[PDB]
Design goal:
The PDB classes it as transferase. Two copies of one chain form a homodimer. By secondary structure, chain A is α+β, with helices and mostly antiparallel strands. Chain A has nine helices and four strands. Chain A has a four-stranded mixed β-sheet with strand order 2-1-3-4, covered by helices on one side. The complex binds glutathione (2 copies). One glutathione is lined by residues 11-13, 46-48, 59-61, 95 of chain A. Residues 11-13, 46-48, 59-61, 95 of chain B line the site of one glutathione.
Chain lengths: 198, 198
């Protein structure tokens, strides 16, 4: 009956959900997933998928929106259309654009994609996206979507954690560094991010 | 002051916004975009981006959520957390997973990516995703997220339109065909989808 979260902890998309549950003080049961039993839940064969008293849901960014909508307060995921859109914008950018930019460099330098040119190119594309994000963080001076922690800081925070947790010569993005150090005081970030969880 | 939509009409992501505006009876000004003037609006250099009385927003799936939240009724984008999550799920699946699966085949067969193996492989991956979607449409027997038209049917409907508008030997997905014929009676689909707009 209680919330079940299916998917291995190393998955960044699974940790979006785990960290959100910590923010919400929502109890859960987590299960490692790399099978019809699973495909019955998520026909795409990807992690995470949740079960919430009979309600089955996949897509990590959808799942965090759902848990926020059901259990969370307004600050976490604001109802006002413009404020909500700023939060959605960075969630959607994380899930469709930013996460694609790191593939070669992450799989190559962290997960062991060993072509020097390909890695250099991924770092280049990742850098250009991190450049956009760094500029936003300078502009707010605080969190990704404004002056306080929101749902967007979960996908964005984990993605910045991934950037610093990938071994290469990092270009100076001071605002990104400020941001990750600010998130590091949060219980969920200590558990599901940091160098231990690239 | 009125809604400005920047981005060329052939873009599927731009047409998500154009079709939604038709559903909402929301007046707009559309401008073709393929430049600092643009990057000031969307630092990613992608289309679409909107301007709404000073409020600037990019990410097509974020933009359609925003316009729905601001101007639309509950049926279009329900407030109830589970119903809302079903809508978000397919929007997020469209924007992160399904749209990636067609790249090789679309660029090759529609936009002129001419490698026979690569095209066959894209068709394979596109087919497996369309297989998931077809199964969902069988399950509801109506629209992607349930018994009535929702925001999710805009990204999903345009994506199904793309599948049928791409010249190759299509595997039988009857429910997908039923669905696209159901959407074809909608004004926005006549304008921004069909064979004229793959
Ligand atoms: N759209 C899916 C993406 C899932 C996906 O494509 N890959 C998973 C593994 S199944 C992932 O976590 N990739 C990121 C990583 O390398 O940690 C979601 O966000 O839930
Ligand atoms: N995440 C962006 C995606 C934009 C993107 O990456 N490409 C645009 C062109 S700038 C597109 O519409 N691609 C689909 C197509 O081939 O029509 C959004 O949804 O707004």
């Amino acid at each position: 009956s209680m919330l079940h979260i299916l998917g291995k902890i190393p998955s960044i998309n699974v940790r979006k959900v785990l960290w959100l549950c910590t923010e919400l003080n929502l109890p859960f049961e987590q299960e490692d997933w790399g099978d019809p039993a699973y495909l019955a839940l998520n026909p795409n064969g990807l992690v995470p998928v949740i079960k919430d008293d009979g309600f089955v849901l996949w897509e990590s960014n959808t799942i965090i929106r759902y848990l926020a909508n059901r259990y969370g307060g307004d600050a976490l995921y604001p109802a006002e259309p413009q404020a909500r859109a700023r939060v959605d914008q960075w969630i959607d950018w994380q899930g469709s654009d930013l996460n694609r930019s790191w593939v070669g460099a992450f799989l190559g330098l962290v997960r062991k994609h060993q072509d020097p040119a390909a890695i250099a190119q991924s770092i280049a594309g990742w850098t250009k996206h991190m450049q956009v994000l760094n500029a936003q963080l300078e502009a707010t001076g605080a969190f990704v979507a404004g002056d306080h922690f929101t749902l967007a800081d979960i996908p964005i925070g984990l993605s910045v954690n991934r950037w610093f947790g990938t071994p290469f010569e990092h270009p100076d993005f001071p605002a990104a560094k400020r941001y990750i150090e600010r998130l590091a005081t949060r219980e969920g970030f200590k558990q599901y991010a940091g160098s231990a969880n690239p």
